């Protein structure tokens, strides 16, 4: 797992700092605004990451604790195959497609569930067609 030094070769710390200044109150940043900044930096935190940092430092992070959080958000082991296999689990006809409604159920049920409108919006933004090529979808979100 990325340390802060390595994080700072991957992202511009000038951005890291400016995004912190945008959201900080009292010299600290809330987990939710830290996750927002992580995403602006092209990182993808889950609730596992949020809860890990919260367990160490509480709801509001100093600048350095925010840097530690970002290092946890890097996820270098992410690959498209694992994402595809998750969806393919529900593709028992082995068609390569799931409908927007099927995709919605898969995304709003278990895990860090999206809201119905979040899942709907992400799916409509991806494709105007109802059949989603989930391999194409996974390749898109990973970039």
């Amino acid at each position: 797992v990325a340390d802060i030094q390595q994080l700072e070769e991957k992202v511009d710390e000038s951005d890291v700092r400016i995004y912190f200044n945008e959201k900080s109150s009292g010299g600290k940043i809330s987990i939710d605004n830290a996750s927002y900044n992580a995403r602006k930096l092209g990182l993808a935190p889950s609730s596992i990451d949020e809860k890990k940092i919260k367990e160490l430092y509480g709801d509001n992070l100093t600048y350095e604790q925010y840097l530690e959080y970002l290092s946890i958000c890097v996820h270098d082991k992410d690959n498209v195959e694992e994402l595809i296999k998750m969806f393919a689990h529900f593709d028992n006809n082995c068609t390569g497609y799931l409908t927007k409604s099927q995709m919605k159920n898969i995304l709003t049920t278990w895990g860090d569930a999206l809201t119905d409108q979040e899942a709907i919006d992400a799916l409509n933004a991806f494709s105007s067609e109802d059949n989603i090529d989930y391999k194409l979808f996974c390749e898109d979100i990973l970039q």
Binding site: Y36, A38, R39, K40, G42, L43, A44, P45, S46, S47, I48, H75, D78, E82, L83, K85, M86, F87, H89, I106, L107, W110, G111, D112, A113, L114, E118, A119, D121, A122, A125, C138, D140, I141, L142
Partner: peptide, 18 residues
């Protein structure tokens, strides 16, 4: 089932829609 990979999908979706 396959919960950790589900978390990554949802994570990247939230990243994309930020």
């Amino acid at each position: 089932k396959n919960i950790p990979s589900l978390l990554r999908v949802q994570a990247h979706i939230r990243k994309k829609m930020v």
